[PDB]
Scaffold this active site. Structure first.
Site, PDB file in Angstrom:
ATOM      1  N   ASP A 130       0.806  -1.213   0.000  1.00 40.26           N
ATOM      2  CA  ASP A 130       0.000   0.000   0.000  1.00 40.26           C
ATOM      3  C   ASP A 130       0.842   1.267   0.000  1.00 40.26           C
ATOM      4  O   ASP A 130       1.354   1.689   1.045  1.00 40.26           O
ATOM      5  CB  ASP A 130      -0.914  -0.040   1.222  1.00 40.26           C
ATOM      6  N   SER A 169      -0.002  15.382 -12.386  1.00 39.71           N
ATOM      7  CA  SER A 169      -0.225  15.015 -13.778  1.00 39.71           C
ATOM      8  C   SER A 169      -0.395  16.252 -14.640  1.00 39.71           C
ATOM      9  O   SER A 169      -0.906  17.279 -14.177  1.00 39.71           O
ATOM     10  CB  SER A 169      -1.480  14.133 -13.851  1.00 39.71           C
TER      11      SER A 169
END
Ligand SMILES: O=C(CNCCc1c[nH]c2ccccc12)Nc1scc(-c2ccccc2)c1C(=O)NCc1ccccc1
EC number: 3.4.23.22
Length: 330
Positions: A35, A199
């Site tokens: 994780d 992004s």
């Protein structure tokens, strides 16, 4: 040193991935969910409330000659779905794909919430976010990667998740046979404890690319792709009959639909998520309404590049002194 371990979807939807981990002496192998969105290595154990264990493999520290109780230490975590677990802490030898860390904090669950009990295939979590998020009190503990780092040939790990198929987690090296073209690296902010990056934009299907900064985290521990409402609406608008359902909990679409791809930018590079990756199947058994894999982050407070996004790429988690993230197609 290096390590390499196969990661396997827990079900036909890729709802999560499990990776075998050896804990203790003699080894006890548990299947953990790696994780990158948390920083605790916690396990089902011989201390877990019996009614809260339903088929998991448990860690029994009393059967490990290298386990030692970390005196006075406790831990407690909860996640965005309101799931939780808590307990006490041992140190023990932990190995992943041939890479061994001695003295790793292993957080033994005394309590776990229903979501975890009900997931018989997940024996715990192995956190790979920054150790600043570790919950052990009163002495915060380091993640597996942090403990391994200085022994690794290179201070990196890579995530190569498969679509309806096994993939790989590697520690300490980049497998140049596992991706196509080049790896594009992008800056990381560690201020919130996460592998947080920006992004450069997106495209829907064969649509034109929209240049726009989308800050979010690279999170192997989250199943779906959570993005701003504007972006998500633009996606689902290209799917006939798609709608946001407050009773279901997000965007649903007709199971007879063909989903468009979704592209996200990494610097000047582009990662394309095929439409099939965005289908999470009927909302209930036998229903003709399917759950979408791209959902709004509006009630979360952060955008999350979860497995739907990461499984379309080869992802480098670069733990050098200034961390960075790398993405390649594959
Ligand atoms: O916690 C992690 C990674 N560990 C996941 C462990 C886990 C939690 N149930 C599990 C069940 C099985 C396996 C692992 C886990 N990432 C982050 S950062 C911010 C949020 C968040 C904050 C507020 C609101 C929503 C998300 C989450 C989050 O809760 N993701 C899962 C999710 C995403 C969307 C909706 C709910 C939960």
């Amino acid at each position: 040193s290096t390590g390499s371990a196969t990661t396997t979807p827990i079900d036909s939807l890729d709802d999560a991935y499990i990776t075998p981990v050896q804990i203790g002496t003699p080894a006890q192998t548990l299947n953990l969910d790696f994780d990158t969105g948390s920083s605790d290595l916690w396990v089902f154990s011989s201390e877990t409330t019996a009614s809260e264990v339903d088929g998991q493999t448990i860690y029994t520290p009393s059967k490990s000659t290298t386990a030692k109780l970390l005196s006075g230490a406790t831990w407690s975590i909860s996640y965005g779905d309101g799931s939780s677990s808590s307990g006490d802490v041992y140190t023990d030898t932990v190995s992943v794909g041939g890479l061994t860390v001695t003295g790793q904090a292993v957080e033994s669950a005394k309590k776990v919430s229903s979501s975890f009990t009900e997931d018989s295939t997940i024996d715990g979590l192995l956190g790979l976010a920054f150790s600043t998020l570790n919950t052990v009190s009163p002495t915060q503990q380091k993640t597996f990667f942090d403990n391994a780092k200085a022994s690794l040939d290179s201070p990196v790990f890579t995530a190569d998740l498969g679509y309806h198929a096994p993939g790989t987690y590697n520690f300490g090296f980049i497998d140049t046979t596992a991706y196509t073209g080049s790896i594009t690296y992008t800056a990381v902010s560690t201020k919130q404890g996460f592998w947080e990056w920006t992004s450069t934009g997106y495209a829907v299907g064969s649509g034109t690319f929209k240049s726009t900064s989308i800050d979010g985290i690279a999170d192997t521990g989250t199943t779906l792709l959570y993005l701003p409402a504007t972006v998500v609406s633009a996606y689902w608008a290209q799917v006939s009959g798609a709608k946001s359902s407050s009773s279901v909990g997000g965007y649903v679409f007709p199971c007879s639909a063909t989903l468009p791809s979704f592209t996200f930018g990494v610097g000047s590079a582009r990662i394309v998520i095929p439409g099939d990756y965005i289908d999470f199947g009927p909302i209930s058994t036998g229903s003709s309404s399917c759950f979408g894999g791209i959902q709004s982050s509006a009630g979360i407070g952060i955008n999350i590049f979860g497995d739907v996004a990461l499984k379309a790429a080869f992802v480098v988690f670069n733990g050098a002194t200034t961390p960075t993230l790398g993405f390649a197609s594959k």
